Amino acid sequence: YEHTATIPNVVGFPYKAHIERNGFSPMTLQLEVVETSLEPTLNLEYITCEYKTVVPSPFIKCCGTSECSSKEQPDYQCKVYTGVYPFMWGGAYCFCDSENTQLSEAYVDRSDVCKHDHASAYKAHTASLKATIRISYGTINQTTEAFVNGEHAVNVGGSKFIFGPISTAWSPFDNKIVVYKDDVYNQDFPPYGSGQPGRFGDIQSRTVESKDLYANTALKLSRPSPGVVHVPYTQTPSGFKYWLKEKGSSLNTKAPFGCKIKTNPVRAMDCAVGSIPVSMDIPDSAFTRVVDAPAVTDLSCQVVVCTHSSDFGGVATLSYKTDKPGDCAVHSHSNVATLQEATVKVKTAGKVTVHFSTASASPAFKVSVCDAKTTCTAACEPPKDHIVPYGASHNNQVFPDMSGTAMTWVQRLASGLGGLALIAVVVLVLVTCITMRR
Amino acid sequence: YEHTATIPNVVGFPYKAHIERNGFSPMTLQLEVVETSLEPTLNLEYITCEYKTVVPSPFIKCCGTSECSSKEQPDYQCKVYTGVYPFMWGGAYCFCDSENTQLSEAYVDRSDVCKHDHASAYKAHTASLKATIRISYGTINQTTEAFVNGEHAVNVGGSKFIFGPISTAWSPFDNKIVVYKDDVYNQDFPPYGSGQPGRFGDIQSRTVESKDLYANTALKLSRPSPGVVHVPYTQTPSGFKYWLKEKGSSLNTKAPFGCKIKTNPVRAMDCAVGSIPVSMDIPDSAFTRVVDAPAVTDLSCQVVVCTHSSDFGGVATLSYKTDKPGDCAVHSHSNVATLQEATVKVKTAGKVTVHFSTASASPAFKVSVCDAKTTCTAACEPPKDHIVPYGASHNNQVFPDMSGTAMTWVQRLASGLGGLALIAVVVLVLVTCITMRR
To answer: Which residues form a coiled coil (chains A, B) (predicted)?
Structure first.
């Protein structure tokens, strides 16, 4: 039996889907989203980490000269300084007072811990949503993971569910992402081969292991101080070690819709956005036949108390006649007010209670109990507590029923002025017939 | 020096970009695409392979009976058959003539070679070009791999190049892809958990190594023949071993634009589609100053021969008056004809020859040598050979020059009829003037 629903993508909000069927007593399923995991597809652009600057001992050539030569190493600098006369602890290092040259050499390399302390610049796109749904109905009460697309049928109790395409493609990850340990950053990182000194990605590596490193750290050698051996040099400090303090708080503290951001893999958990279609194929063995169910009749509804609070702040008492005791599926056919319980034990004592949640000062909604249907109506007070630690169980529909007091006054006004306008029309049509004839 | 070009995404077409600059003698770069690799992002949906049907020996209980149990194994079938009376080679297996049962049991498993002989169903999206470009100018003559987006500067000879976003996002891979060894198949494979018996994906596994296997092979047990031990059963033949003979030929034989399709990773090589923007940042050290270049003057052209064949079928000798010998850059400013050589050795002998490829019956194009410019004009014959093993070196622009013989005849006809029409208009207007005076 194919049935379709559309549940909110709201975690821990148990949606009730009501399946009325021809030969069988109606069935209510609960569909509660236990988790979701919106996971982007990632392309690694490059790895960044602190640089190491490699500065050998100066090749001081006493009484001679020592030409420099190029090398392939990143940001490599080499210069030969003529006319040095350096001292060591025991005296001058060279015999010649001026015919000496110091070869100074320095270059940049990936740090020794870059395998362990690095940030990955990713492009992030085409997110796929996996949800954990709890399905329950009758004896079946089971939790199953499903990919939220029109293309993964998951078995529950012999039923197959397809959780159709998520209503919106939205995701909190921008097109460019930086990932670092537990944290994710929306960050327009500099393209590979164009990173700049003292900013994130001043050195860049296409992978943690890659032999080829882009480095642009503005390393410049300068001439050694007179009589001093030290290979002096200036270089712009590590842009990664600037980023680590400049980061701010990560996307986990900033994502919309209450998303909780996690890494390994990069995913946005529990984003309370959109709605999930469901296709439900329920077998006949799930239902009970109308010959088995109680013949609930003359169902009526009285609301004992109602508060339009965020929890199940209203209490209905349902009263009826029945031929036998037994379970009945119970539902509210209006989003004005949702019900706490999916099923009720109908008993020959002829009365039942059902708890409901609404956002409106005067709801009206058609409850059913098995085949029987009735209209509940209430006067609902506002709550006293301004703020609560839980989300609404209602659908936030606030427009009052036309039988409510506000709409009653509106009806009395509009029928008063309309009746006066009708009398004015009657008078004018009467007179204008006379002035047509005469 | 920021400069921009746009090269055809045609492998081995040696596009030549001409830089004209105020302080410096002009420069022609070659930009030859050696390879492209259009690689889709792949999400693995599931693994398919031939199933192994596991059928234990029949548990025949003599003089007794057996219950049986459901097991959480794929496609698992079990039935107990009452009243068996089997014969082994030496006689009846059981004493009792009807108080016996055979427990027949069978289930589906993944085949033992599914680690090796399996097909992986992927979704393919947001393909990224990588291209191998050969850059040459002067003594710099070098090959660099670049990602073709506006976001990867590569250094050649101290010059940055950015190969901008490919003009079209086309790729030969459909949204759903099946990969098998060297082959890629465009194939709408069945969603996971919905594969059907005897067709591709009758068994499905989310990964090669996963513990959980979907199976839907229509395995059914049937009663053992009287007096025979054999566990009879029917099952639909492996949908993967049907697919292997039904595949046909892979996307490698069918992709548009001449794409060559390869795996590990899935990539479409050398697709001849679109054009690649280029940004150049050439340093001044690459140029030569106009004080150093030849002062080429009195440049004039005659075309010694021209066939508008797919190769460089035209030859144009350039007569010039220099002041010194030197290397001059040479370029053709009109895309009706592409030159073969980017530079020419200017000699005091005052003549040299240049080869060009054209597709039109009569091109005219502004050749330049250093600063000097002249218009070459030709009358080009068609080639004799109907088919050639190589692509056109020209841009396939075929409209003739307005000074060509066809357009000369059109100009004669159109100016003759236009002149006669103007004379008729003048006669009419003059007659209207005279009859206005009268």
So the answer is: none
